[PDB]
């Protein structure tokens, strides 16, 4: 059936550096052929927020940031893949269809 991916971008600097995670790891997320949804907290606010629903539906979950972001006790119960931020921009493809191979592998 139709699965489901999330993340969270968290930055220190803010929320311009959050989109560039964000942006990569959705088309990422787009290529792997399910549902994205990617919240970013920064000192400039919160934009995209994910609801209870969306971290549910959530198959795979990427916590994508530098510094502990104000809304990971809604992911405390779940299963997430933290990362670094900058990883979110260069390995963005990289993580996903590592996610996707590993949860794979398992559920075969």
């Given amino acids: 059936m139709s699965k489901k991916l999330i993340a969270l971008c968290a930055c220190p600097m803010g929320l311009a550096h959050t989109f560039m995670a964000a942006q990569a790891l959705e088309e990422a997320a787009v290529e792997a052929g399910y549902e994205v949804k990617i919240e970013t907290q920064g000192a ?9 629903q969306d971290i549910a539906e959530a198959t795979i979950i990427i916590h994508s940031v530098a510094v502990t972001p104000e809304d990971n006790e809604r992911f405390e119960s779940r299963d997430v893949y933290e990362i670094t931020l900058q990883d979110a921009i260069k390995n963005a ?5 590592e996610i996707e191979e590993m949860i794979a592998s398992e559920q075969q």
């Fill in 93 to 97: 493809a990289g993580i996903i269809k």
């Fill in 44 to 52: 400039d606010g919160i934009q995209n927020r994910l609801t209870a």
